[PDB]
Structure 1
């Protein structure tokens, strides 16, 4: 029950509504977190995911960074039925750097072995405002030819309208 090829869906809303939708439509999926390399889940989707997943997830992440140092990608328990795992991905920050290629590498790092359904925020395009258009294009490049299902979500309607502009 892989898909035959890449399938997209969209959701504009807070994490709670996104997760309810993904559970209804995917049944089981990986949630992607827009993380920093310290896994310090202080704001944005990171805070929402840490609040939703709870203290065992926050503790997991903190403990891992303590043992292994800062991480650019960290796959964790979610402690939530239907969420196979959290994939904490570190996007570039504004003034970075070289944004398109960094965002492609970030979205490519979303894929995990044994997971087909992904619930994915617009990386880098909130708490440190990278242009959402390059994040979104970067995602489309990253996932080309992958047999996965991707539910792109965001608080901003503009992000999804823009995404629909190429899927339309």
Structure 2
């Protein structure tokens, strides 16, 4: 079970933690991946989660894309969680470094509402280029299910908690 999380709202919790280490420890029903439309898990959270599965997440993802085609920005798919979780919810937040609509961030967070509890990163944060303070605000105003946010960066975690309205 989840431990050491700071409660932000009725249903949103946050911790300064590596989401791979958090997943390996808790083994949640759902771990969220910060995916791209192609499910190419190269860097950031996706690269780290895939490397922890010994590339099994990428192999499974390539078969999914070969069958179904790419996801939509703001969309998701449920795949195996491998050694990290029962399931991985691959969610595509807009990548502002690729010029994608930041307004799609709320649609991306709506995917979390189909799962009662999730371990997740902040969508569109990190290498996706959005303001993590904005991502946390969209998260608390969109997600109604129980979300345990893992923020890798200590200095960003402190800034997020200290600025939370």
TM-score range normalised by the length of the shorter chain: 0.7 to 0.9
Mapped pair 1:108 → 2:110:
yes
CA contact (8 A) 2:93 2:124 kept: yes
Equivalent position of 2:13 in the other structure: 9
Regions of 4+ moved over 6 Å: none
Equivalent position of 1:35 in the other structure: 35
Q: Which runs of 5+ in 2 are unaligned?
A: 1-8
CA contact (8 A) 2:33 2:91 kept: yes
Report the count of equivalent residues.
Answer: 153
What RMSD over aligned residues (CA atoms) do the two structures have, in Å? 2.4
Equivalent position of 2:71 in the other structure: 71
CA contact (8 A) 2:19 2:121 kept: no
Cα offset, 1:98, TM superposition: 3.7
Q: Which runs of 5+ in 1 are unaligned?
A: none
SS of the aligned residue for 1:109 comes to helix
Distance 1:70 1:128 in 2: 18
Equivalent position of 1:151 in the other structure: 148
SS of the aligned residue for 2:120 comes to strand
TM norm structure 1: 0.78
TM norm structure 2: 0.79
